[PDB]
Structure 1
Amino acid sequence: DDEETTALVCDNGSGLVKAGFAGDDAPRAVFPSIVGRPRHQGVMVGMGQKDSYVGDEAQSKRGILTLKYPIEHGIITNWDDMEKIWHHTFYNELRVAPEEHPTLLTEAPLNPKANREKMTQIMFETFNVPAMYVAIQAVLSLYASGRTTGIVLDSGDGVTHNVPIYEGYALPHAIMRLDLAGRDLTDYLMKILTERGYSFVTTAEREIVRDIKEKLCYVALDFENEMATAASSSSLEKSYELPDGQVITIGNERFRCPETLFQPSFIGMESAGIHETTYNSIMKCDIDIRKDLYANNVLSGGTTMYPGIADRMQKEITALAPSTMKIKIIAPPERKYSVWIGGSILASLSTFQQMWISKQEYDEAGPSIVHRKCF
């Protein structure tokens, strides 16, 4: 009921799905990627409970229903759930006809091709959008940076990687993977809370604990000195009302939860921390790209919302990087939605319809087309 169209900038953020129109200032839809199964499924007069309309409704009315991510580990194992998820999206908070508007889709690196294959044809068929296009959430956040050069620590929704760049020029050889996720810190901190005399196993407990993080957990620049403090650091014992109501006490965990992103020994990953992954990616870089990398040390992720994260960056590099070069880590406050912003700009790139996955091109070339010479 308007002019030509505006794109459908839709993000499948690892934890929450977020989206808006082309060039919107904020993805109007955001909510957990959960599927809900009411445990006991009590029989009452009438009904009123849908199985898995989780969206944002389920967690509030959580407990009976369990939690499910189709994309559990940044990779989706079930889709029926998931396409109904997008239907909820496009008809409950997008409440829009997909056929009406073009949509750009977020796909993470290392995906098997068939994943985007199907996501495509299903969106075509069920959603019959005018047509679609997809892009790497990492890459979309990278355009959200506008910083043509430098690496980005894309530790955002539920994934972590490094994205070395120069003038938009990134090396796939220079990009690695980090299975670490908000889920991982979740499991770790839940473990610690339990072992400290607590029963933290339940799903809603899982959401509560992540929130406990996001509003409480920080990271200390120094590790042992701050742990010695915690031996008697009477500052850090802030106890927080367990949302059920009894204040839950907190100590040094308020920081020593996520640092394991530098030391996965306690979380148990042979992998090396974020910092040295960035650094070795740096070494594999060419000679002088590295000063820019220092200056283009663009962080990304709201999961990385922790205090002193960037400063811990500069100091750790310093310990690693030569003092001769100068280190400048970037980290926008708008990092988790920066991916969606870059998607909105790129899909909004009305000079850039040509890359668009249309009905015909797909149909004549089937699913495989979107993969050859395009994405």
Structure 2
Amino acid sequence: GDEVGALVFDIGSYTVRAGYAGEDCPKVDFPTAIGMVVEGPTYYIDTNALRVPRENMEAISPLKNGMVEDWDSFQAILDHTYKMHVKSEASLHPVLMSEAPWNTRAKREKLTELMFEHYNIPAFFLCKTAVLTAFANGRSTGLILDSGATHTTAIPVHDGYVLQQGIVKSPLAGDFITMQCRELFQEMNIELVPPYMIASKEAVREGSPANWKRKEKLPQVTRSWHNYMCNCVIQDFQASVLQVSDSTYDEQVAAQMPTVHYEFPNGYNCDFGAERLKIPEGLFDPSNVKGLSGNTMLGVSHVVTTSVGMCDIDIRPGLYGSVIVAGGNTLIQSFTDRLNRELSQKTPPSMRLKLIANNTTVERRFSSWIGGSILASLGTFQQMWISKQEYEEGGKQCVERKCP
């Protein structure tokens, strides 16, 4: 048994993942956010507490640009994980976690201290998420693209080592897609009737007025919580509508799709047309965004060009040998096909190009967790453990000595 009962944890821009080491899939997952009812206090985690309506929730995301925000929230979420799902004493079990490209050494030391002292963990380890994902593809030198719910970032790797320079913190993400859905609703004027406030969704046709019943037993919620559950609804709608034009966008070309009959919580159900393809084309170039002259963002092909150019010459062929996807917002249809088309166009044929063939939701999102479990499985890695005895000896300061 060259594997000990270790547990790998994966937290992304969109949701939170974890599972045993060496397994096919993370055991569980749940929303990144937590609902707060100020009065220890009332914490709402997982769907039964968060999405199910209550009174006065102020949902809070303890994450920001891949940074630790509410340490108490992280501790509470770890405890929630443990009890509600794992029901085990990891103090008896080695654990490890990924890390951001930019996580502060101060917060890494803080979490290392907290883990070892409170959680009584027997061993720990850290490494960057993109490195885990690259492992997942069995790769040593490549370019990682992740459209997590927060950003749309690109980070190259070499010999299993990230290029610190290659970080691109593009804003566009599922947040941007939610903004696109909102501007769509505005231009065609549909409000947001959340499901929770609908007792019965009565029969209604396309264009029909929203017909529904409310359940009187509905204590009022906060704008934060209500807006975020509406955002979940919007993301569901996007998924129901996800697609991108495979070529230079045209309004009527996109309209040629049969308007998809999408239904809403009220029971209303209209049919949506070219807008779902007008929107995404901006993702490939923000300049062309009608109405919003986004220029600060780099178009998809523009991101490719920036990332490639900023590297050095010798390995750029190596990076071009690999191209990878990741993130909650990577659900988009026409994602990889149009990506590669834009490559073949803007990317010169001078250097051979090669992508990574993985599109299932499982791979497309949890490749990072897969890589983490992959590393945990390896028999040689055990010399790279981090014994709690060493931490007891040298404080949390051992991280700098042992982690560059």
Identify whether the pair has TM-score above 0.5, normalized to the shorter chain: yes
Contact 2:123 2:385 in 1 (8 A): yes
Counterpart position of 2:392:
363
Q: CA deviation at 1:244?
A: 3.7
2:222 corresponding residue in structure 1: none
User: For the Cα contact (< 8 Å) 1:29–1:94, is it kept in 2?
Assistant: no
Distance 1:179 1:357, change over 3 A: farther
User: Are positions 1:54 and 2:78 aligned together?
Assistant: no
Alignment pair present for 1:202 and 2:227: yes
One-letter amino acid of the structure 1 residue matched with residue 242 of structure 2: C
The whole-number CA distance in structure 1 between the counterparts of 2:376 and 2:81 is: 18
2:337 aligned with 1:315: no
Work out whether residues 13 and 328 of structure 2, in 8 Å CA contact, stay in contact via their aligned partners in 1.
no
- Counterparts of 1:157 and 1:349, CA distance in 2: 31
> Hey, what's the Cα distance between the residues in 1 that align with 2:118 and 2:270?
46
Distance 2:373 2:389 in 1: 24
The gaps in structure 1 that reach 5 residues or longer are 42-49
CA displacement 1:160-185 (0-9 Å, x = unmatched): 32232344354222333323332232
Superposition deviation, residue 359 in structure 1? 2.0
**Per-residue deviation, residues 227-257 of structure 1 (Å, max 9, x unmatched):** 2324xx2525213111342225433333344
| Shift in CA distance, 102/79, structure 1 to aligned 2, threshold 3 Å | same
Structure 2 counterpart of 1:263, one-letter code: D
1:5 matched residue in structure 2:
4
Letter of the 1:209 counterpart: I
Match of 2:236 among 201, 208, 211: 211
1:229 aligns with 2:253: yes
CA contact (8 A) 2:244 2:281 kept: yes
* Aligned residue type for 1:346: L
Alignment-mate amino acid for residue 34 of structure 2: V
In 2 relative to 1, CA 209–295 (structure 1 residues): closer, same or farther, beyond 3 Å?
same
- Tell me by how many angstroms 1:282 deviates: 1.2
In the alignment, which of 282, 298, 313 is matched to residue 308 of structure 2?
Answer: 282
**How has the CA–CA distance of structure 1 residues 269 and 62 changed in structure 2, closer, same or farther, with 3 Å as cutoff?**
farther
CA deviation string 1:57-83 (max 9, x = no partner): 234404643422100332232121221
**Amino acid in structure 2 at the alignment position of 1:277:** V
Q: Which amino acid is the alignment partner of residue 46 of structure 2?
A: G
Q: Which residue of 1 aligns with 2:283?
A: 261
Distance in 2 (CA, whole Å) between partners of 1:66 and 1:250 is: 33
Of 264, 274, 277, the match for 1:242: 264
What SS does the corresponding residue of 2:319 show, helix, strand or coil? helix
Deviations 1:88-111 (A, max 9, x none): 111211222120211111211112
Kept after mapping to 2: 8 A contact 1:63/1:204: no
Q: Which of 245, 260, 268 in structure 2 is aligned with 1:220?
A: 245
Which residue of structure 2 lines up, in the alignment, with residue 179 of structure 1? Answer: 171
1:264, 1:372 → 2: CA distance? 43
Q: 1:168 to 1:81 in 2, by over 3 A?
A: closer
Match of 2:30 in 1: 31
**Distance change (3 Å), C-alpha of 1:209 and 1:178:** same
- TM-score (norm. length: structure 2): 0.80
Q: Rate the CA distance shift 1:282–1:248 in 2: closer, same or farther, 3 A.
A: same
**What CA RMSD, in Å, does the superposition of the two structures yield over aligned residues?**
2.7
Q: Is the 8 A contact 1:239 1:250 kept in 2?
A: yes
Distance, in Å, in 1 between the alignment partners of 2:183 and 2:154 is 28
> Which residue identity lines up with residue 171 of structure 1 in the other structure?
L
> Which aligned pairs between 1:35-114 and structure 2 lie closer than 5 A?
35-38=34-37, 51-62=42-53, 64=55, 65-114=57-106
> Which is further off, 305-314 or 22-31?
305-314
State the SS of the aligned residue for 2:365: coil
> Which blocks of at least 5 consecutive residues in structure 2 are unaligned?
193-225
Native 8 Å contact 2:249 2:277 kept in 1: no
Q: Aligned pair in 2 of structure 1 residues 169, 135: CA closer, same or farther (>3 Å)?
A: closer
- Does the C-alpha gap of structure 1 residues 193 and 77 become closer, same or farther in structure 2, counting only changes over 3 Å? same
Cα distance 1:72–1:97, how it changes in 2: closer, same or farther (>3 A)?
same
After superposition, give the CA deviation of every residue in 1:146-201 in whole Å (9 maximum; x if it has no partner). 12232121334543322323443542223333233322322332233234302348
CA contact (8 A) 1:102 1:129 kept: yes
Q: Quote the sequence identity (%).
A: 38
Match of 1:142 in 2: 134
